[PDB]
């Protein structure tokens, strides 16, 4: 079965493309990583770093999360990221999204031994 810490690389992580993105990018990306099989998946964001860097991120600013948990950690470094934004006329199956790259400090919830990221809370 998939760990959390496996599900947070297939939702979260590409570090293939170092920023780029297509404008087809999201639509393909999130189609692959299969964010689109039960619903269009509204928001989701990808990571164009190393999955050291953002592993990393567990021992950098611990933050509030957004649902008030505690064990959220802010990259002292921008990352390469992209943005990923269910258009208005999305319509599941064929989901569609608008894809926008960034450079921005990521807030991820890290949890377990080893303690590793398993949610992508924000980028600020």
Known sequence: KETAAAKFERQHMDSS????????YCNQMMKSRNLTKDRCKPVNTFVHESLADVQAVCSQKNVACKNGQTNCYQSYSTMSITDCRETGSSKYPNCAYKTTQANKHIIVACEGNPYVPVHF????
């Open 17 to 24: 493309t170092s920023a780029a993105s297509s404008s087809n």
């Open 121 to 124: 809370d924000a980028s600020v």
